[PDB]
């Protein structure tokens, strides 16, 4: 019989798809903690130079 | 033979593998002997190869359909070592409905064998006869410009045809030559006179 | 057994039935291949009589073995035309350019028709001005303004036809298709 | 014998094995390079526009 082995390669299929959606998702998270990270930063400098 | 002609209602999507994209199954056949031998080679053709994949799917008065699953890079490898084995896969597709339009082809080639012959029927006869008009125009315009050639000034031909039915054209040609050669002439009796044949 | 056409979205065209009946009177080999062709139109390619002539090039090198159809609808819905082998086009004065096979008809849902006779060749004729077909004592058997406006149809010896026309002696053009086979 | 096979019937399940290990080692390297651009863009374009920001404010 050969259908045994194609659940697994099936499951295989599956982990490939949910990696890709990871870590696509952690790229876009990580674009949008950059953006994050660097209005912060600017807002920091801002202060300081508004402040002097 | 049912491995080599269109398996279009033989073989089924279960022999396949479907929506799967690094493995796929081919379908194979195996002459009368070589049943164990293949069936214990099958997965030496190529590598990745799902082992223990043999099974039946048809057979024919010469040979047994077979199938191997394995990945799509191998299929190849896998037909061309069978066919320089002396050994033939079987080639189909999953179309779902190759049945249905290969039987519509056949169908039109049944009507059109018989509509065509009849409008090639009606263009020949027709060209029989326009063809065969502007045939006997041509000869008519030979024989007159021949007489204007060989004759003199006003056209007084008499412009007959004569029909020799039994083995006598040759004959016919050579009593009228002799007996009225000198028409064209005492030293040009090539034909003397003006003479043609329609050979009907 | 049937025919075929090329229109492309306008009002009025030609119906099969009539070019069916059309179909019985014309020279053979002609009548086997049946694809009819919309060589010129009135609603869809203007209404002058230059791009009537500059729409129909004698383009007869593919088949010169071709009939040419023109159909013509009068004031009050009286249909007829004539049958053509050679494509219409303004030529010197030596000459009437048409075979001895050519005929006129007056259709309807009522089929008539007059071949051409070998009384004589008059009014097959083709110039800048005017396209007229049988001719002789009188006017012209069929005859189309440079405007395309108006026409006139009589009996002619070319022909002896009797007149097409709802309006005999003279009429106006409502709608004109030409045909090529 | 409803089963045409040469070998053990355990070798299937080793190659099955090793099928998917490499599935999964493939994934893994791809996530790896995914994770790792996600990471030095995090610093490129974060250093861009911190510093042509700074820049006109300043």
Same mark, same amino acid.
């Not at chain 1, 982990?15 to 876009?28: D, F, G, L, N, P």
């Not at chain 2, 082992?51 to 190849?76: C, G, M, R, T, W």
């Not at chain 3, 065209?13 to 179909?23: A, F, G, S, V, W």
């Not at chain 3, 309807?108 to 028709?113: A, I, V």
């Given at each position: 019989?050969?259908?045994?082995?194609?659940?697994?390669?099936?499951?295989?299929?599956?982990?490939?798809?949910? +990696?890709?959606?990871?870590?696509?998702?952690?790229?876009?998270?990580?674009?949008?903690?950059?953006?994050?990270?660097?209005?912060?930063? +600017?807002?920091?400098?801002? +202060?300081?130079?508004?402040?002097? | 033979?049912?491995? =080599?002609?269109?398996?279009?209602?033989?073989?089924?999507?279960?022999?396949?593998?479907?929506?799967?994209?690094?493995?796929?199954?081919?379908?194979?056949?195996?002459?009368?002997?070589?049943?164990?031998?293949?069936?214990?080679?099958?997965?030496?053709?190529?590598?990745?190869?799902?082992?223990?994949?043999?099974?039946?799917?048809?057979?024919?008065?010469?040979?047994?359909?077979?199938?191997?699953?394995?990945?799509?890079?191998?299929?190849?490898?896998? /037909? /061309?070592?069978?066919?320089?084995?002396?050994?033939?896969?079987?080639?189909?597709? #999953?179309?779902?409905?190759?049945?249905?339009?290969?039987?519509?082809?056949?169908?039109?080639?049944?009507?059109?064998?018989?509509?065509?012959?009849?409008?090639? =029927?009606?263009?020949?006869?027709?060209? #029989?006869?326009? =063809?065969?008009?502007?045939?006997?125009?041509?000869?008519?315009?030979? =024989?007159?410009?021949?007489?204007?050639?060989? #004759?003199?000034?006003?056209?007084?031909?008499?412009?007959?045809?004569?029909?020799?039915?039994?083995?006598?054209?040759?004959?016919?040609?050579?009593?009228?030559?002799?007996?009225?050669?000198?028409?064209?002439?005492?030293?040009?009796?090539?034909?003397?006179?003006?003479?043609?044949?329609?050979?009907? | 057994?049937?025919?075929?056409?090329?229109?492309?979205?306008?009002?009025?065209?030609?119906?099969?039935?009539?070019?069916?009946?059309?179909?019985?009177?014309?020279?053979? *080999?002609?009548?086997?291949?049946? !694809?009819?062709?919309?060589?010129?139109?009135?609603?869809?390619?203007?209404? @002058?009589?230059? @791009?009537?002539?500059?729409?129909?090039?004698?383009?007869? %090198? !593919?088949?010169?073995?071709?009939?040419?159809?023109?159909?013509?609808?009068?004031?009050?819905?009286?249909?007829?035309?004539?049958?053509?082998?050679?494509?219409?086009?303004?030529?010197?004065?030596?000459?009437?350019?048409?075979?001895? !096979?050519?005929?006129?008809?007056?259709?309807? %849902?009522?089929? @008539?028709?007059?071949?051409?006779?070998?009384?004589? !060749?008059?009014?097959?004729?083709?110039?800048?001005?005017?396209?007229?077909?049988?001719?002789?004592?009188?006017?012209?058997?069929?005859?189309?303004?440079?405007?395309?406006?108006?026409?006139?149809?009589?009996?002619?010896?070319?022909? $002896?036809?009797?007149?097409?026309?709802?309006? $005999? %002696?003279?009429?106006?053009?409502?709608?004109?298709?030409?045909? *090529?086979? | 014998?409803?089963? &045409?096979?040469?070998?053990?019937?355990?070798?299937?399940?080793?190659?099955?094995?090793?099928?998917?290990?490499?599935?999964?080692?493939?994934?893994?390297?791809?996530?790896?390079?995914?994770?790792?651009?996600?990471?030095?863009?995090?610093? &490129?374009?974060?250093?861009?526009?911190?510093?042509?920001?700074?820049?006109? &404010?300043?």
């Amino acid at each position: 019989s050969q259908k045994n082995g194609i659940a697994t390669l099936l499951q295989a299929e599956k982990e490939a798809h949910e +990696i890709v959606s990871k870590a696509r998702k952690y790229r876009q998270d990580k674009l949008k903690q950059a953006k994050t990270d660097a209005a912060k930063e +600017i807002d920091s400098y801002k +202060i300081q130079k508004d402040k002097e | 033979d049912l491995s =080599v002609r269109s398996l279009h209602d033989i073989v089924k999507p279960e022999d396949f593998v479907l929506n799967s994209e690094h493995l796929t199954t081919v379908l194979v056949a195996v002459p009368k002997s070589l049943k164990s031998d293949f069936e214990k080679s099958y997965e030496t053709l190529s590598k990745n190869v799902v082992p223990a994949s043999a099974s039946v799917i048809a057979e024919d008065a010469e040979y047994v359909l077979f199938n191997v699953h394995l990945f799509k890079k191998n299929v190849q490898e896998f /037909t /061309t070592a069978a066919r320089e084995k002396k050994f033939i896969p079987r080639e189909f597709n #999953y179309s779902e409905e190759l049945i249905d339009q290969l039987k519509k082809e056949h169908d039109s080639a049944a009507s059109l064998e018989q509509s065509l012959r009849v409008q090639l =029927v009606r263009l020949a006869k027709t060209a #029989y006869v326009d =063809v065969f008009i502007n045939w006997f125009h041509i000869k008519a315009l030979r =024989v007159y410009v021949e007489s204007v050639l060989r #004759y003199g000034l006003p056209p007084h031909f008499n412009i007959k045809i004569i029909a020799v039915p039994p083995k006598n054209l040759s004959k016919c040609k050579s009593e009228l030559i002799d007996a009225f050669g000198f028409l064209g002439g005492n030293a040009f009796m090539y034909e003397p006179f003006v003479m043609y044949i329609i050979n009907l | 057994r049937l025919n075929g056409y090329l229109p492309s979205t306008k009002n009025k065209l030609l119906t099969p039935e009539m070019c069916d009946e059309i179909r019985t009177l014309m020279p053979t *080999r002609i009548q086997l291949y049946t !694809e009819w062709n919309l060589l010129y139109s009135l609603e869809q390619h203007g209404s @002058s009589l230059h @791009s009537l002539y500059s729409n129909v090039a004698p383009d007869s %090198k !593919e088949f010169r073995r071709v009939g040419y159809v023109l159909v013509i609808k009068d004031r009050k819905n009286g249909i007829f035309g004539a049958y053509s082998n050679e494509a219409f086009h303004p030529n010197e004065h030596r000459q009437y350019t048409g075979n001895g !096979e050519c005929f006129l008809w007056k259709l309807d %849902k009522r089929f @008539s028709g007059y071949p051409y006779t070998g009384v004589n !060749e008059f009014a097959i004729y083709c110039t800048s001005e005017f396209l007229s077909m049988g001719a002789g004592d009188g006017h012209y058997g069929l005859l189309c303004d440079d405007g395309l406006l108006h026409g006139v149809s009589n009996p002619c010896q070319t022909y $002896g036809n009797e007149v097409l026309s709802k309006e $005999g %002696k003279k009429f106006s053009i409502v709608a004109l298709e030409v045909w *090529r086979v | 014998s409803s089963a &045409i096979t040469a070998l053990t019937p355990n070798q299937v399940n080793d190659e099955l094995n090793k099928m998917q290990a490499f599935i999964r080692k493939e994934a893994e390297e791809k996530a790896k390079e995914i994770q790792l651009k996600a990471d030095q863009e995090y610093e &490129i374009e974060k250093t861009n526009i911190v510093r042509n920001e700074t820049n006109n &404010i300043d």
